[PDB]
Structure formats: structure tokens, C-alpha cells
Amino acid sequence: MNKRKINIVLYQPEIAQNVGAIMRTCVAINARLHIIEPLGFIFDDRHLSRSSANEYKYVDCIRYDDWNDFITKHQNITLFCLSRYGQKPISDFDFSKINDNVYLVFGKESTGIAKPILKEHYNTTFRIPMISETRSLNIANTVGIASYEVLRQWDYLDLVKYETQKGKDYILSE
Amino acid sequence: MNKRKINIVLYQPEIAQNVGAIMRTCVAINARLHIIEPLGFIFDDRHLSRSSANEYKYVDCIRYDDWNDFITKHQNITLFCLSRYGQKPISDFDFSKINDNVYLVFGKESTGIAKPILKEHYNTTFRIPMISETRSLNIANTVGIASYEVLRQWDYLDLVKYETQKGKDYILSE
Numbered sequence: 001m002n003k004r005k006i007n008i009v010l011y012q013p014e015i016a017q018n019v020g021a022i023m024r025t026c027v028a029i030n031a032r033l034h035i036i037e038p039l040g041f042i043f044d045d046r047h048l049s050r051s052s053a054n055e056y057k058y059v060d061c062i063r064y065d066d067w068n069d070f071i072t073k074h075q076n077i078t079l080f081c082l083s084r085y086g087q088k089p090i091s092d093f094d095f096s097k098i099n100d101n102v103y104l105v106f107g108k109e110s111t112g113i114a115k116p117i118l119k120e121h122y123n124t125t126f127r128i129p130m131i132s133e134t135r136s137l138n139i140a141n142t143v144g145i146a147s148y149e150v151l152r153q154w155d156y157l158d159l160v161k162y163e164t165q166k167g168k169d170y171i172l173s174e
Numbered sequence: 175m176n177k178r179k180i181n182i183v184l185y186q187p188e189i190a191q192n193v194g195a196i197m198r199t200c201v202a203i204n205a206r207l208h209i210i211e212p213l214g215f216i217f218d219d220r221h222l223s224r225s226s227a228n229e230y231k232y233v234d235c236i237r238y239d240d241w242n243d244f245i246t247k248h249q250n251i252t253l254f255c256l257s258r259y260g261q262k263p264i265s266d267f268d269f270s271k272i273n274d275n276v277y278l279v280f281g282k283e284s285t286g287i288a289k290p291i292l293k294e295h296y297n298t299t300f301r302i303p304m305i306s307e308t309r310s311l312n313i314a315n316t317v318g319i320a321s322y323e324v325l326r327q328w329d330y331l332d333l334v335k336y337e338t339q340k341g342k343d344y345i346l347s348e
Contacts, residue, residue, distance in 0.1 A: 021312055028304040028311055053310065085341040091326045119345055129325070129333035130202040136227065137202055137318065138195055144315040145322045151303070152265045152323070159303035167259040171293055 004098070004154050006031035006147050009079070009105040011067070011113050013139070014040030018109060020051025021140035027055040029147055029159060032101075036064045040108075067117070074103070079121045081105040081113050082142055086127035090146050093126065095153040104146050109139050178272070178328050180205035180321050183253070183279040185241070185287050187313070188214030192283060194225025195314035201229040203321055203333060206275075210238045214282075241291070248277070253295045255279040255287050256316055260301035264320050267300065269327040278320050283313050 008031050013019050019035070026033045041047055043063075048056040064070040080090065080103065095102060105121075107113030118125055128142055137145075151157065182205050187193050193209070200207045215221055217237075222230040238244040254264065254277065269276060279295075281287030292299055302316055311319075325331065 021315065025311060025315060028309040030305045053312075085337050085345055087337050087342065089326075089330065089335055115345065122342070122345055127335075127337070128322070129330040129335045131204045131333060133334070135202040137199060138227075138314070140312070141195065141199060141315050141318040144311065144319050148302070148319045148323075149326070152263075156263065156303040159305060160307070161263055161301075161303045163259050163261050163301070168261065168296070171259055171289065171296055 002157070003100050004157055005101050006150060007034060007101050007103045008032070008143055008147070009034040009036065009070070009103055011036050011105060011107045011117070012038055012040070014108050014110060015139075016041040016047040017051045018139045019043075020048045020056065021138075022143050023048060023052040023059040023061070024055040025140065025144050025147065026059050026061075029151060030157075031060075031147060033059055033061045034064065034070060034103075035061060036067055036070055067114070077101070077103060078124055079103050079105045079117075080124045080126055080146075081118055081121050082107070082146065083112055083118055083125045083127060084133065085118070086125040087122070088126065089129055090126040090149045093124070095150045102150055104143070104150070106139055106143055176331070177274050178331055179275050180324060181208060181275050181277045182206070182317055182321070183208040183210065183244070183277055185210050185279060185281045185291070186212055186214070188282050188284060189313075190215040190221040191225045192313045193217075194222045194230065195312075196317050197222060197226040197233040197235070198229040199314065199318050199321065200233050200235075203325060205234075205321060207233055207235045208238065208244060208277075209235060210241055210244055241288070251275070251277060252298055253277050253279045253291075254298045254300055254320075255292055255295050256281070256320065257286055257292055257299045257301060258307065259292070260299040261296070262300065263303055264300040264323045267298070269324045276324055278317070278324070280313055280317055
């Protein structure tokens with residue numbers, strides 16, 4: 001059986017707009033979203049509707065009281081953690097070896113993931129290459145870049161990869 | 175010499191927030207940003223500051239009166255165009271063959287790129303795989319996913335791919 005599934009873990013996100021955009025990405029690729037309290041914003045439809053393009057309503061989402069709660073429920077799992085100080089790009093890990101849940105962990109836009117977690121998981125920390133250390137990407141865009149690298153190595157699972165003949169002879173004619 | 179450069183082309187973007195986020199991505203990877211009028215918003219520091227995290231100030235950006243203006247200045251270049259109806263994923267084109275400007279073209283969040291452009295460039299149209307056609311990603315997130323696929327095939331050019339020994343023995347100790 002296929003047991004391959006993208007799991008996105010957000011460690012104490014601050015910004016409603018970022019969580020909303022991530023929800024929209026998670027719906028698009030059928031990922032599971034794990035959110036670890038506390039949050040910097042009010043978690044409801046009012047604050048997540050616009051940034052999620054209404055995908056708040058359909059996202060597969062689990063909330064946890066704190067890190068300990070999440071770890072308690074996920075014993076002996078590998079976490080791939082995004083850091084400024086991550087050893088190498090995510091494209092350098094071999095995900096074709098894995099037929100299981102993969103967990104991509106993203107921290108607060110301000111200061112990333114707690115140092116004790118990175119230390120614990122230093123061997124599976126990844127970075128997104130940029131021109132320098134004064135540079136940054138929006139956290140929502142990083143969830144997309146990291147997710148689609150794992151998805152490429154899985155041949156995009158059951159996502160729709162190719163245009164039908166309906167599409168092509170529509171554009172190359174009508 | 176290296177002539178490899180990411181060029182992002184935005185065809186009549188509607189939303190200031192999207193252009194701002196793209197500017198931030200362009201600065202992070204040293205891409206050139208080509209913007210084609212008309213725009214759905216006021217193009218100034220006031221509307222682009224927050225969404226760009228102030229990267230508006232440093233982005234390498236060129237503006238064009240319309241499509242004809244852009245094409246006039248870019249005769250016989252290949253355009254890789256994002257479409258819902260794109261033939262295959264961007265990871266299926268071989269960019270390792272190219273030592274030149276690559277042009278990734280993105281249309282308005284509402285209705286994508288003008289049909290006559292897609293028809294003209296149907297052979298180099300790409301899609302971002304998703305679970306179905308009712309699904310969508312934010313345009314800014316698509317610029318990141320597409321850019322970093324080309325960058326992976328170029329071994330990330332001169333972006334910073336690896337942590338120094340300063341970083342590692344900082345975390346694995348201090």
C-alpha cells in the first residue's frame with residue numbers, strides 16, 4: 001500500500017496570514033497540518049478565510065497543547081526541520097527510500113524553531129539556499145518549496161501531473 | 175562564463191501583496207523581475223513595503239508598457255509559462271542543458287496568462303501538480319516552487335547551500 005503522506009508541522013506560528021496560506025497549500029497537495037500552541041493570533045474562520053482562499057473549511061488539521069503533546073503522540077519519528085543553520089538543501093535527502101508519513105517542521109517567522117529541537121534533530125535539518133544570511137523567504141513559500149521537493153522525489157503521488165487531450169487541443173485550436 | 179539567471183515575468187498582476195512577496199523571493203535568489211502593465215494596484219513603496227519585508231528597495235525590476243513592449247525587447251527567447259492547462263510539471267524539463275537567461279512567466283491570480291500567449295508557447299507550458307482542478311496555490315508560492323526547481327537543476331548556482339563548521343558546532347554544543 002502507499003503510506004507516503006506530507007505532514008506539515010508549524011511550531012508556534014505568529015501570523016494568521018501565514019497559517020492561512022499554508023492551509024491553502026496543504027489542501028492543494030492533500031497534506032496533513034499539525035499546529036503546535038501557543039499561536040500569535042486568533043484561530044477561527046474570521047482570521048483564516050481570506051489568506052486560505054476559504055480552504056480553512058477543508059484542511060486536515062490537528063492542534064497540540066505544546067511540543068511535549070506532539071512528541072508524546074509521535075514517538076520515534078524522524079523530523080525534517082527548516083533552519084537558517086540547516087546542514088544542506090532538502091533536495092539532498094533521499095525521500096524515494098521512504099514509504100511512510102514524512103514530517104516537515106517550520107518555526108515562527110521571527111526566530112525559527114526552538115534550539116533544543118534543532119540540536120535533537122540536527123542530522124535531518126535542511127535549509128532553503130539563498131544569496132546570503134541577511135535574506136529570508138515568507139514561511140508559507142518555504143512550506144511550498146520543501147513540500148514540492150519531497151513530492152517530486154515521490155513522482156507527485158496521485159496529484160494531477162499531465163494535461164489531458166481535452167486541454168491541449170482546446171488551446172492548440174479553440 | 176555563467177550566463178544562468180532566473181527571470182520572473184508577471185503578466186498584469188492584480189494584487190500588491192502578491193508582487194511584494196515575489197519581490198522578496200527575487201531578492202533572496204538574485205532573480206530579475208519583469209512586470210507587464212497594466213497592474214491592478216498602485217506600484218510604490220507604500221503598497222509593496224510590508225509584503226516584500228522591505229525588499230522592494232533592492233529588487234532588480236524592469237517595467238513594460240504591455241506584452242508587445244516586452245516581446246519587442248526579448249526577440250526569439252523561450253518562455254516557460256505557468257498554466258492550469260500546462261502539459262507537465264516544471265521538473266520534467268531539462269534546465270541543465272541551458273546556460274542563459276531562463277524566463278518563468280506567471281499570470282493574474284484570477285484568470286492566468288492570455289490564451290494567445292499560451293497557444294504561441296504551448297510546448298514550454300508547465301503546471302504545478304495539485305489534487306484537482308478546483309484547487310489553487312497563491313501565485314507568490316508558485317514563483318518560489320518553479321524558481322527552486324530550475325535552481326536545483328543548476329546546483330543552486332552561487333546561493334549558500336551548506337552550513338559552515340561555525341553553524342554546526344554552535345548548535346551541536348553552545
